[PDB]
Write an enzyme that holds these catalytic residues in place. Structure first.
Site, PDB file in Angstrom:
ATOM      1  N   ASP A 267       5.340 -15.385   9.491  1.00 52.24           N
ATOM      2  CA  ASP A 267       5.684 -15.075   8.107  1.00 52.24           C
ATOM      3  C   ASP A 267       4.810 -15.929   7.201  1.00 52.24           C
ATOM      4  O   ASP A 267       4.495 -17.072   7.538  1.00 52.24           O
ATOM      5  CB  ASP A 267       7.145 -15.417   7.815  1.00 52.24           C
ATOM      6  CG  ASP A 267       7.374 -16.923   7.688  1.00 52.24           C
ATOM      7  OD1 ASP A 267       7.493 -17.597   8.726  1.00 52.24           O
ATOM      8  OD2 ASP A 267       7.405 -17.437   6.551  1.00 52.24           O
ATOM      9  N   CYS A 307      -4.013   2.369   3.908  1.00 53.91           N
ATOM     10  CA  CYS A 307      -2.895   2.272   2.976  1.00 53.91           C
ATOM     11  C   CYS A 307      -3.004   3.268   1.808  1.00 53.91           C
ATOM     12  O   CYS A 307      -4.084   3.775   1.502  1.00 53.91           O
ATOM     13  CB  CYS A 307      -2.716   0.831   2.492  1.00 53.91           C
ATOM     14  SG  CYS A 307      -3.504   0.426   0.906  1.00 53.91           S
ATOM     15  N   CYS A 310      -5.528   2.399  -1.001  1.00 55.62           N
ATOM     16  CA  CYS A 310      -6.941   2.629  -0.717  1.00 55.62           C
ATOM     17  C   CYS A 310      -7.255   4.115  -0.589  1.00 55.62           C
ATOM     18  O   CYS A 310      -8.414   4.505  -0.653  1.00 55.62           O
ATOM     19  CB  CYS A 310      -7.370   1.878   0.543  1.00 55.62           C
ATOM     20  SG  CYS A 310      -7.380   0.094   0.340  1.00 55.62           S
ATOM     21  N   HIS A 336      -1.392  -3.104  -0.724  1.00 55.75           N
ATOM     22  CA  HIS A 336      -2.570  -3.140   0.127  1.00 55.75           C
ATOM     23  C   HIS A 336      -2.601  -4.376   1.047  1.00 55.75           C
ATOM     24  O   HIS A 336      -2.913  -4.261   2.235  1.00 55.75           O
ATOM     25  CB  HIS A 336      -3.866  -3.096  -0.686  1.00 55.75           C
ATOM     26  CG  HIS A 336      -5.044  -3.529   0.117  1.00 55.75           C
ATOM     27  ND1 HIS A 336      -5.685  -2.689   0.999  1.00 55.75           N
ATOM     28  CD2 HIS A 336      -5.619  -4.745   0.263  1.00 55.75           C
ATOM     29  CE1 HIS A 336      -6.637  -3.358   1.623  1.00 55.75           C
ATOM     30  NE2 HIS A 336      -6.612  -4.611   1.201  1.00 55.75           N
TER      31      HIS A 336
END
Ligand SMILES: CNc1nc2cc3c(=O)[nH]c(N)nc3cc2[nH]1
Ligand SMILES: CNc1nc2cc3c(=O)[nH]c(N)nc3cc2[nH]1
Ligand SMILES: [Zn+2]
Ligand SMILES: [Zn+2]
EC number: 2.4.2.29
Lengths: 370, 370
Positions: A267, A307, A310, A336
């Site tokens: 994370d 994504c 994009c 993104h």
């Protein structure tokens, strides 16, 4: 369907890929967990977080217990319901944030008393209870994150207290039938940069027994070289058959190197935070979208990225949004970057399963740091 | 398919409902246009703007000519492509914003010279050219918005100059073959609060001939009573067979009253801006979501609203986001408010088509101001 079941499907060196099955969903490993500290992954709807590929997100005991409050969240039906994320959520235990965010702090064997950035208490028992109230799927033991640097003696006493608190966390978790039946509990290894302390810590954790094991006390200023050195000896000390979680890491290169050393879970706020600040991740390294060179660039943020951002918007447009301080700018950049992180995890998982992860790491680095 | 075709399907008193067909899409009237001043409807993706029901959005010549620049936007393929909205866009002509936003201003028969909030010029010819470069579907004539209050003499000279500029706007627009073939041009009525001046203005506009007619010079501090009074006599002066656009209006009650007086088109920043500020529109009147009374309220923002926000998230959650300054808070509030506005427009359109708009207005007001 099961409470917690970790299965390793493939290996290459110390690297592993597999799945964790939990009642709220499957987590593909190695996994990246977007950070949702204030009960939101900043600037993203949960459906969008899921669209990027995330299987699980991270919440924070520390922030949520202050605002809006743990009992309040429970009364509102639990964190999942509150924020509209119905998949697994791992919550950190408060131990790290209480030390780096609280204006004042008082530590004892009981736990930590602290001032809200209002006076509050944290202890293994209270931390576990808060996470129960939040309805976390993966609960972290309450611990102390040793400051870096630390003498061997200071790291030792700190680690030992953490191990005592780990036992109490285990007991408090096990005492709560509904938590024990539906959630999982991870222990946190401490011991700073010292091999003997990391070992004693791992031995203590394994003797208590946990569903997963985090490597704590890293990403605290030590630098990648040192972090990797510690991981080299620390990860093999953990049970091989349980997930290995490296807390608070990190940059793409850190992630790749950590996977090469046996880490299954990650994370970091980097993709979200730096996203809002104008930094976009690409396979050719990061770029700052505010830079004038992008003002008329019609290409997407990254040429390969799958994504939605994009697929539709140009660098020039996003450059405009970010420079104008527009919220949509933060939204697109964040989507993104989280998507980029998830695609990195996917390529890591695929390459390990196909036994070509070593080559991927090499190819990734040669291009990313070109 | 057609360049611009306005068709009135039903009427009740002065109220009309119908459609404007343009090459990039159909606009259902009466219509509300979300404002996308910096080439974004703040905190919303275009797909989300469309999901709320918007058929058309508003852009600004003034803001876009400064940042990122009109020639730049043209080079990047036009505003639609730049921001990813493929449906109609109406652009205001700069005349109003140059007067209320520019730090310094110099007015003449030629046009306005002004300082960027950098020195710049605006004229009917330059305004039309900028809108051509942006690729606007509905182009506004360049005009002067008379300050309120104004003497009859000052309103007169101001209105007359606007009418001269309207002719020049018409000529510049018609000179650009690609613009004349694909876009539409609206004139702007001026004359302040004075009936005789409004009439002369309308006569001048009609003599030149436009695709639509805006009522300008209102929503400038006059208050609803005065605005309605002016609309009472001004709207019937405009050609009945062309759309009637009330610029910069407004609150839900203003919209309803304006439709009762023959207005077909509206734009305001209220739903987006007040959305970010914590104000949510409901059928029972607006509420401030930051208020403590909402901290544990599990109901959606509005009990009837069909929007995605009200389908999923509680007032308590949104209250938390807004108070924490979280971007998602602005996103959800804005989506709901724009959705609320579009649902209001839908109910207006349905009630007019069904000949029960008078009753709707009465029912709407009795509940909204209860
Ligand atoms: C960004 N760097 C970072 N290092 C961490 C260590 C710990 C740790 O040792 N313990 C707990 N509870 N959380 C952590 C979170 C971290 N985050
Ligand atoms: C928010 N109130 C508002 N009144 C307006 C009047 C005009 C006007 O008379 N002319 C042009 N060009 N834009 C306008 C925009 C407005 N916006
Ligand atoms: Zn992308
Ligand atoms: Zn709603």
């Amino acid at each position: 369907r099961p409470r917690f079941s970790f299965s390793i499907a493939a290996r290459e060196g110390k690297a592993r890929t597999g799945t964790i099955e939990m009642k709220r969903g499957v987590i593909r490993t190695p996994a990246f967990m977007p950070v949702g500290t204030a009960a939101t992954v900043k600037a993203l709807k949960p459906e969008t977080v899921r669209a990027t590929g995330a299987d699980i997100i991270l919440g924070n005991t520390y922030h949520l217990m202050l605002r809006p409050g743990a009992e309040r969240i429970a009364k509102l039906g639990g964190l999942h319901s509150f924020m509209g994320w119905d998949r697994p959520i791992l919550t950190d235990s408060g131990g790290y944030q209480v030390m780096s965010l609280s204006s004042l702090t008082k530590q004892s064997e009981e736990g930590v008393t602290f001032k809200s950035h209002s006076r509050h208490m944290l202890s293994p028992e209270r931390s576990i209870e808060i996470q129960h109230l939040l309805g976390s799927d993966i609960v972290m033991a309450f611990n102390e994150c040793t400051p870096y640097p630390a003498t061997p003696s200071r790291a030792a006493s700190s680690m030992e207290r953490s191990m005592r608190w780990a036992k109490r966390s285990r007991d408090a978790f096990d005492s709560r039938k509904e938590q024990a039946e539906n959630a999982a509990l991870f222990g946190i290894q401490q011991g700073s940069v010292f091999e003997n302390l990391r070992q004693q810590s791992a031995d203590a954790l394994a003797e208590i027994g946990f569903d997963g094991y985090a490597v704590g006390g890293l990403a605290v200023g030590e630098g990648q070289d040192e972090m990797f050195r510690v991981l080299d000896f620390s990860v093999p000390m953990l049970p091989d058959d349980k997930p290995h979680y490296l807390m608070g890491v990190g940059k793409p290169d850190d992630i790749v190197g950590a996977v090469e050393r046996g880490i299954d879970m990650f994370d970091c706020v980097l993709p979200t935070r730096s996203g809002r600040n104008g930094q976009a991740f690409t396979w050719d390294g990061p770029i700052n979208i505010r830079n004038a060179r992008f003002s008329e660039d019609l290409k997407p943020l990254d040429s390969e990225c799958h994504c939605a951002v994009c697929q539709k918007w140009s660098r020039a447009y996003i450059h405009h949004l970010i420079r104008a301080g527009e919220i949509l700018g933060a939204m697109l950049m964040t989507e993104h970057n989280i998507a980029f992180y998830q695609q990195l995890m996917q390529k890591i998982r695929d390459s390990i399963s196909e036994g070509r992860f070593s080559q991927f790491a090499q190819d990734f680095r040669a291009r990313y740091f070109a």
